[PDB]
Amino acid sequence: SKAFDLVVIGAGSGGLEAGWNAATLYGKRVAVVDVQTSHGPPFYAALGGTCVNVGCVPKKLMVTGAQYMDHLRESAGFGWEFDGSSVKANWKKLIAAKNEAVLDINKSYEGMFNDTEGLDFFLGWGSLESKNVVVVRETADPKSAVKERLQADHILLATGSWPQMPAIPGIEHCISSNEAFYLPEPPRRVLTVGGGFISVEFAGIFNAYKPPGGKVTLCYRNNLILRGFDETIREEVTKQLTANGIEIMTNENPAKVSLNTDGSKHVTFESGKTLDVDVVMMAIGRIPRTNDLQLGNVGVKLTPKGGVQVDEFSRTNVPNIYAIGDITDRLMLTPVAINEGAALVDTVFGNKPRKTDHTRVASAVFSIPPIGTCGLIEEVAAKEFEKVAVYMSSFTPLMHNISGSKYKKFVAKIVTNHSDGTVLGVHLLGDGAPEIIQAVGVCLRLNAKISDFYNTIGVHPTSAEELCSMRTPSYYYVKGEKMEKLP
Amino acid sequence: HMSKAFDLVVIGAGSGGLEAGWNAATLYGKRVAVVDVQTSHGPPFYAALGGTCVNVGCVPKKLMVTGAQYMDHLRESAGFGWEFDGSSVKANWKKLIAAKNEAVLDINKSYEGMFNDTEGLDFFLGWGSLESKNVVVVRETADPKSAVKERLQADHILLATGSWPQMPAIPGIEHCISSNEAFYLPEPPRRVLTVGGGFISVEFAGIFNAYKPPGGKVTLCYRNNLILRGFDETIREEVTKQLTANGIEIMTNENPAKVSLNTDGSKHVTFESGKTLDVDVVMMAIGRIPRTNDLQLGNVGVKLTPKGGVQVDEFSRTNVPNIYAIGDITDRLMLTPVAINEGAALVDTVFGNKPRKTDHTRVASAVFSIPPIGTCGLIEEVAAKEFEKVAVYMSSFTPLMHNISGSKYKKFVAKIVTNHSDGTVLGVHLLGDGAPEIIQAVGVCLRLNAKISDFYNTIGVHPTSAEELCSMRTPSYYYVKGEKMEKLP
Numbered sequence: 011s012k013a014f015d016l017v018v019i020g021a022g023s024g025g026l027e028a029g030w031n032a033a034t035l036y037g038k039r040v041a042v043v044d045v046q047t048s049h050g051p052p053f054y055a056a057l058g059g060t061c062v063n064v065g066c067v068p069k070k071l072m073v074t075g076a077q078y079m080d081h082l083r084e085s086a087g088f089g090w091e092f093d094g095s096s097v098k099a100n101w102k103k104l105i106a107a108k109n110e111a112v113l114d115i116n117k118s119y120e121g122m123f124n125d126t127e128g129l130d131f132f133l134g135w136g137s138l139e140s141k142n143v144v145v146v147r148e149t150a151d152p153k154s155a156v157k158e159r160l161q162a163d164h165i166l167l168a169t170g171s172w173p174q175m176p177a178i179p180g181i182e183h184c185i186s187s188n189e190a191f192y193l194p195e196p197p198r199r200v201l202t203v204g205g206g207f208i209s210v211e212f213a214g215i216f217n218a219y220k221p222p223g224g225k226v227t228l229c230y231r232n233n234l235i236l237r238g239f240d241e242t243i244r245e246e247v248t249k250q251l252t253a254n255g256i257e258i259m260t261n262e263n264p265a266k267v268s269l270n271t272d273g274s275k276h277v278t279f280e281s282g283k284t285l286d287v288d289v290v291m292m293a294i295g296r297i298p299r300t301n302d303l304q305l306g307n308v309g310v311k312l313t314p315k316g317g318v319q320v321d322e323f324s325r326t327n328v329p330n331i332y333a334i335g336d337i338t339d340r341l342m343l344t345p346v347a348i349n350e351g352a353a354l355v356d357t358v359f360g361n362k363p364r365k366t367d368h369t370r371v372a373s374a375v376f377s378i379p380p381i382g383t384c385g386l387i388e389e390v391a392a393k394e395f396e397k398v399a400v401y402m403s404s405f406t407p408l409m410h411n412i413s414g415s416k417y418k419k420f421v422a423k424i425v426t427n428h429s430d431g432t433v434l435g436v437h438l439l440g441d442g443a444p445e446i447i448q449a450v451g452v453c454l455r456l457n458a459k460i461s462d463f464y465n466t467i468g469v470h471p472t473s474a475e476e477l478c479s480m481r482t483p484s485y486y487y488v489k490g491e492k493m494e495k496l497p
Numbered sequence: 498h499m500s501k502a503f504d505l506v507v508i509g510a511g512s513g514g515l516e517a518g519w520n521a522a523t524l525y526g527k528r529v530a531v532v533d534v535q536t537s538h539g540p541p542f543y544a545a546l547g548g549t550c551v552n553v554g555c556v557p558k559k560l561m562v563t564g565a566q567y568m569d570h571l572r573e574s575a576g577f578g579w580e581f582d583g584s585s586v587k588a589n590w591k592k593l594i595a596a597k598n599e600a601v602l603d604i605n606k607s608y609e610g611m612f613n614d615t616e617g618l619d620f621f622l623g624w625g626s627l628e629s630k631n632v633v634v635v636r637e638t639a640d641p642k643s644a645v646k647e648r649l650q651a652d653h654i655l656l657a658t659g660s661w662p663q664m665p666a667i668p669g670i671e672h673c674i675s676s677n678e679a680f681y682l683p684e685p686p687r688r689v690l691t692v693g694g695g696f697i698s699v700e701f702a703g704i705f706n707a708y709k710p711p712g713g714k715v716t717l718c719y720r721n722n723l724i725l726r727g728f729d730e731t732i733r734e735e736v737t738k739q740l741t742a743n744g745i746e747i748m749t750n751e752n753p754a755k756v757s758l759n760t761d762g763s764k765h766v767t768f769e770s771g772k773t774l775d776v777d778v779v780m781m782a783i784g785r786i787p788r789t790n791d792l793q794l795g796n797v798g799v800k801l802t803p804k805g806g807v808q809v810d811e812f813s814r815t816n817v818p819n820i821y822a823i824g825d826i827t828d829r830l831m832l833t834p835v836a837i838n839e840g841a842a843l844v845d846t847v848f849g850n851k852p853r854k855t856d857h858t859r860v861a862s863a864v865f866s867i868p869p870i871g872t873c874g875l876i877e878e879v880a881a882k883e884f885e886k887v888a889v890y891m892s893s894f895t896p897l898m899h900n901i902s903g904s905k906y907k908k909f910v911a912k913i914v915t916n917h918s919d920g921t922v923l924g925v926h927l928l929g930d931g932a933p934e935i936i937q938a939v940g941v942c943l944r945l946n947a948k949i950s951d952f953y954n955t956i957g958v959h960p961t962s963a964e965e966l967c968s969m970r971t972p973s974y975y976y977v978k979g980e981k982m983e984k985l986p
C-alpha cells in the first residue's frame with residue numbers, strides 16, 4: 011500500500027501529460043496505471059496511449075506508405091520511367107517497420123518513468139475502490155487478484171475510448187482498427203464500415219496495399235461521409251476517393267455478417283444487398299472506456315452518452331476525482347487530451363486555474379488527399395450569426411495536371427462573420443492541408459479577419475497562398491438561409 | 498497611323514505590371530496599356546507576357562523541383578514496403594522540359610486572352626522606353642535606334658521591367674549560362690557547376706542532381722564560407738549537410754577565375770585557388786540586377802540608386818511625379834508576391850482614393866531546395882542588433898517517417914525568434930518537408946503581432962511537423978545586448 015498526490019488511470023496522451031507535469035513542474039508524487047507496457051494484442055493500447063500504440067502515430071506512418079502508390083504513378087508525368095509491372099506493395103514490411111517505431115516509443119516512455127523523480131508506473135487494471143483509493147488488479151475482472159492499493163489525494167480518470175461495435179448478428183466476425191494494425195496479410199477485398207475519419211483513412215491505406223484484383227469498399231449509413239466536416243470537402247473527398255478506386259456505398263448499413271467456407275465474410279445490408287469480403291472493419295464510432303473503472307463504488311456521474319461528466323476544469327461530481335481525454339466524450343484528439351491534462355494540473359497544483367478551450371481546435375484527416383480544418387463549418391456558423399460569408403477557391407493545381415491526377419482539386423474555404431469580417435472557420439482539402447492549417451489555428455486566436463488574410467503577402471508558389479487571395483465572398487447565409495447575394 | 502492614349506502605361510507585363518494593369522482597368526475603369534517584348538516563354542528573350550516568374554522563374558522551377566523530388570520518393574518508398582526494379586529507373590529530362598513548356602505556354606495563352614477580352618486593358622508587343630514625361634515609345638528591339646512600332650501617351654507611367662541574371666567578367670564567360678538557358682537545356686548535364694550560394698543556385702543544384710544521367714555529378718560553388726546568406730544560420734548549415742547527403746558537392750570559399758573548352762568540348766573551370774573542375778555546364782547564379790538600361794531613363798531624369806535600382810519612396814513614386822516603379826526594378830525584395838502587392842497598392846493610391854504602402858517587413862518566403870525552407874521575419878543575429886533581449890526557441894530532430902524512409906539526414910528545423918521583453922514573434926524559420934506551406938499562415942500571425950504565447954496556447958494538429966511551432970514554451974537560448982547565451986544573467 012502506497013501514498014501519492016495524484017494517481018492517473020491510463021498512461022495515455024492526456025494521462026502522461028498530467029503525470030509528468032505534476033511530478034516535474036510541481037514536485038508531486040505521481041503514480042500512473044496502464045494495462046500493458048507495449049503495443050499490440052491482447053489489449054492493443056498500452057503505455058503511451060491509443061495514439062502512440064494503435065492511433066495517430068502508426069496510422070500516419072501507414073498513410074505515408076499508402077501515398078507512394080500515388081507518387082510512383084504520378085512520377086511518370088515528370089519524366090520518371092521504370093518497370094511498372096515490377097511494382098509491389100509489401101504490407102508485411104510496412105507492418106514490421108511500424109511495429110519497430112511504436113516499440114521504440116514504448117521503451118522511451120519506460121525510460122522516462124525510470125528517469126523521473128516522483129513518477130511511478132504500475133502495470134494492471136485500475137478501478138475506484140473508494141474516494142481516495144485506486145486498486146490495481148491483474149485483469150479487467152473486479153474479482154481478479156489485487157496487485158496494488160494506491161491511496162491518492164487526487165485521482166485522474168484518463169482511460170480513453172474503445173471501438174463501438176453494433177449489435178448485429180455476426181458482429182464477432184468483424185474487426186476494428188485495433189486489429190487492422192496487425193493483419194498478417196493485406197486484405198484483398200475489404201469493407202470499412204463508417205463515414206468518419208478512421209474508416210476513410212483505413213480505406214486509403216488498404217487501397218494502396220491491396221494485392222492484385224483487390225477492392226476496397228467503404229459504406230456509410232447516411233448520404234454523405236465525414237459528418238462534421240465542410241460539406242464541399244465531404245463531397246470532393248468522396249469524389250477523389252472514388253477516382254482512386256475506392257467504392258463508396260452511402261445509405262447502406264450492415265444488418266448481419268456470416269462466415270463463408272473459405273474464411274471470407276458474407277455481409278448482408280439492411281437494404282438486402284450483399285457483399286463478400288475478406289475483412290469487415292467496423293469504424294462507426296469510439297465510446298468512452300468507463301466499464302472497468304467501477305465508478306459506482308464512488309458515484310462518479312456519467313452523461314447520457316456514457317462519458318464521465320466534467321465541468322470546464324475537468325472536475326467530476328466527486329471532489330478530488332477528475333477526468334480528461336476521450337473518456338469525457340467531447341473532442342477525441344490527442345492534443346486536446348494533452349491540453350486538458352496540463353490545464354488540470356496547473357489548476358490543482360499551481361496557483362492559476364486553467365481551462366482548455368475546445369473552440370477553434372485545428373485538426374486533420376489523413377485521407378488521400380488529406381483534410382485540414384480549424385473552426386466552424388458554414389452551416390454551424392449560420393445558426394450562430396445573422397450574416398455569414400463563405401469564401402471559396404477550388405481548382406486542380408498545375409502539378410496534378412502534369413502528374414495525371416487531374417481529379418485532385420485543392421479546396422480552400424474561409425467562413426466569416428460577415429458583420430465584422432472575423433474568420434470563424436478555415437477548411438482545406440489537398441496535399442499539405444494538415445501542415446497549412448496549424449498556423450491558421452494561431453490566427454484564430456488573434457481574432458484574424460478575412461482582410462488580415464488577404465492583406466498578407468503570399469508565399470509563391472504554394473497551395474497555402476490561396477488563403478491570402480480571397481477578397482470576395484462566393485455566397486452567404488442570412489438568418490440561416492444560403493444565398494448567393496446579400497438581401 | 499496615330500498614337501494611342503492611356504491613363505496608365507505599364508512597361509513590363511510581369512508579376513507587378515499585370516496586377517497594376519488589371520486592377521486599374523477592372524476596378525477603377527482606367528484605360529491601360531501594357532508592353533512586353535515577347536508573347537510566350539523562351540528564347541530569345543526568355544521572359545515574356547506574364548513575367549519572369551511565369552516564364553523562367555517560380556512557376557517552371559517549382560514544377561522541375563517537384564519532378565526532382567521523385568528521386569527521393571522512389572528511394573524512400575522502400576522503407577514503407579514498396580518494391581520495384583531499381584535498375585529500370587530513369588529520369589527523362591526531355592519529358593520534364595516538354596511538360597513544363599506546355600504548362601507555361603498555357604499560361605501565356607490565357608494572358609493573351611485576358612488582353613483580347615478586357616475593356617481598357619491593351620497589350621503592345623515590343624520594347625518600351627521613356628521618350629518624355631507622358632510618352633512611352635515601343636520599338637522593335639532594345640536598341641533605341643530600332644524602328645518605332647507605337648507611341649503610347651500616358652498620364653501615368655509604371656516601370657516594372659524586372660531583373661536579369663548578372664554575369665561576372667571572367668575570361669571564358671561566354672562558355673557559361675544562366676538560369677534562363679537552364680530551363681531549355683536539350684539534355685540534362687552529366688557534370689554541372691552551379692555558381693552562387695543563393696536560392697537559384699541551390700534550387701537548380703537539386704534539379705540537376707535528380708535528372709543527371711548515370712555517373713553524373715552536381716557541384717555548387719560559393720565564394721564565401723556558407724551558402725544562403727540572409728537565411729537562418731542553423732538552416733544554412735543544415736541545408737548544406739542535406740544537399741551533401743544527397744550527393745551534391747558544395748565548394749565554399751571558391752570562385753571561378755576563368756573557363757576554357759577542353760578538346761572534347763567540355764568546360765574546364767579554374768578557380769581563383771587554382772583548383773580545377775571539368776563540367777559539361779557552368780550555370781552562373783550569382784545575382785540578378787534591375788533591368789533599367791533599355792528604358793532610356795535619362796530622357797526624363799528618373800533617378801537610380803547607387804545600387805542601380807529605380808529610386809522610389811514608400812508609395813513607389815520616382816522623382817518624376819507621374820512615373821512609378823515596382824518589383825525587381827527597385828532592387829529590393831525580388832519576390833513575385835511583393836511585386837504584386839506593390840502594384841495593387843500603387844493603383845489603389847493613384848486611382849482609388851485609398852492610399853496604401855506595401856509592408857516590406859514580415860514577408861513570408863521559401864526556398865524550394867530538397868528539402869525546402871520556409872521563413873518569415875528576422876533572423877536572430879539581425880534581431881539581436883535591434884532588441885536588447887532576444888529569445889530563440891528551437892526544435893530540431895529527424896522526423897519519424899524519415900527514420901523509416903532511410904533519409905535520416907533529413908532533420909526538420911523549426912525556430913521562433915522573439916523580442917523577449919514582451920514575447921512578440923520577430924521571425925519564424927523552418928527547414929523540412931512542407932515548410933513553404935506551413936509558413937504562409939505564419940505570415941498572417943506576424944502581421945497580427947502574434948506573441949510566443951499565442952503560438953504556445955494554440956492546440957497542435959497531430960501528427961504534423963507544423964505542431965512543433967505550437968509546442969515551444971522555453972527558450973533554447975538568448976541574445977542580451979547582442980551577446981548569445983544559454984541563460985539570462
Ligand SMILES: Cc1cc2nc3c(=O)[nH]c(=O)nc-3n(C[C@H](O)[C@H](O)[C@H](O)COP(=O)(O)OP(=O)(O)OC[C@H]3O[C@@H](n4cnc5c(N)ncnc54)[C@H](O)[C@@H]3O)c2cc1C
Binds near residue numbers: 060137341
Ligand atoms: C485509429 C485511430 C487514429 C487516430 N488518429 C488520430 C490523429 O491523427 N490525431 C489525433 O489527434 N487523434 C487521433 N486519434 C485519437 C487519439 O488516439 C485519442 O484522442 C487519444 O489517444 C486519447 O487520449 P487519452 O489520454 O484520452 O487516452 P489514451 O491515449 O487512449 O490512453 C488511455 C490508456 O488507458 C489505458 N487503460 C484503459 N483502461 C484502463 C484501466 N482500467 N486501467 C489501466 N489502464 C487503462 C489504455 O491501455 C490506454 O493506454 C486516433 C484514434 C484512433 C483509434
Ligand SMILES: Cc1cc2nc3c(=O)[nH]c(=O)nc-3n(C[C@H](O)[C@H](O)[C@H](O)COP(=O)(O)OP(=O)(O)OC[C@H]3O[C@@H](n4cnc5c(N)ncnc54)[C@H](O)[C@@H]3O)c2cc1C
Binds near residue numbers: 542660697791
Ligand atoms: C529562376 C528564378 C526563380 C524564382 N523563383 C521565385 C519563387 O519561387 N518565388 C518568388 O516569389 N519569386 C521567385 N522569383 C522572382 C520573381 O520571378 C520576381 O521577383 C518577379 O517576377 C518580379 O516581378 P516584376 O513584376 O518585378 O517583373 P517580371 O515578372 O520580371 O516582369 C518584367 C517583364 O518586363 C519585360 N520587359 C523588360 N524590359 C522591357 C522593356 N524595355 N519593354 C517591355 N517589356 C520589358 C520582361 O520581358 C518581363 O516579362 C524567381 C526568379 C528566378 C529568376
Ligand SMILES: [Br-]
Binds near residue numbers: 232233234235237
Ligand atoms: Br449525411
Ligand SMILES: [Br-]
Binds near residue numbers: 588589590591684
Ligand atoms: Br533525358
Ligand SMILES: [Br-]
Binds near residue numbers: 954
Ligand atoms: Br507561453
Ligand code: NA
Binds near residue numbers: 204229230232263294
Ligand atoms: Na455507418
